[PDB]
């Protein structure tokens, strides 16, 4: 993974994490696993990496880049990410 404020809104990795304070999309870069906090989801924009985020079910949600998924119903509680 890496730290990057999205690529202008059309690349890099962007994830919508909602918890504690309020909703907020985190944006990193490359592939790898990065602890999320055990509760930080609301949508995901993996448009450049096969991202895997262990949702509340430790459900390694491995999206294969170029994919926007969320958790407005499923178990909302990503324990961490892991793009590969």
**Pairing relation of β-strands 59-62 and 52-55?**
antiparallel
Q: Which of 57, 27, 21 is nearest to 43 (CA)?
A: 27
Q: What's the CA gap between 8 and 80, in Å, rounded?
A: 24
**Within a 13 Å sphere around the CA of 73, how many CA atoms are in the beta-carbon half?**
1
Nearest Cα to 82, choosing from 41, 42, 36, 43? 36
Burial class (CB in 10 A: 0-12, 13-18, 19+), 44: buried
Range(s) of the domain holding residue 36: 1-84
- How was this one solved? NMR
- CATH number of the domain bearing residue 55: 2.60.20.30
Name the helix (H) or strand (E) containing 68. Answer: strand 68-69
**70 three-class SS:** coil
Q: What's the Cα-to-Cα distance from 38 to each of 7, 27, 43, 45, 53, rounded to whole Å?
A: 26, 17, 15, 19, 10
The answer to whether residues 11 and 47 touch, using CB atoms and an 8 Å cutoff, is yes
Query: What is the C-alpha to C-alpha distance for residues 30 and 39, in angstroms, rounded to an integer?
Result: 22
Count up the domains in the chain and report the number.
Answer: 1
- Residue 34's contacts (CB-CB under 8 Å, 6 or more residues apart) are 1, 28, 80, 81, 82
């Amino acid at each position: 993974i890496d730290h990057v404020p999205c690529r202008g809104g059309e690349n890099f990795l962007k994830i919508w994490s909602h918890s504690g304070g309020q909703q907020s999309v985190d944006c990193y870069a490359n592939r790898g696993r990065i602890d999320f906090g055990g509760w930080w989801v609301d949508k995901i924009s993996t448009g450049n990496n096969d991202l895997i985020y262990y949702d509340a079910n430790g459900d390694s949600v491995r999206v294969d880049r170029w994919h926007d998924i969320t958790y407005p119903n499923r178990p909302p509680k990503v324990n961490s990410i892991e793009i590969l």
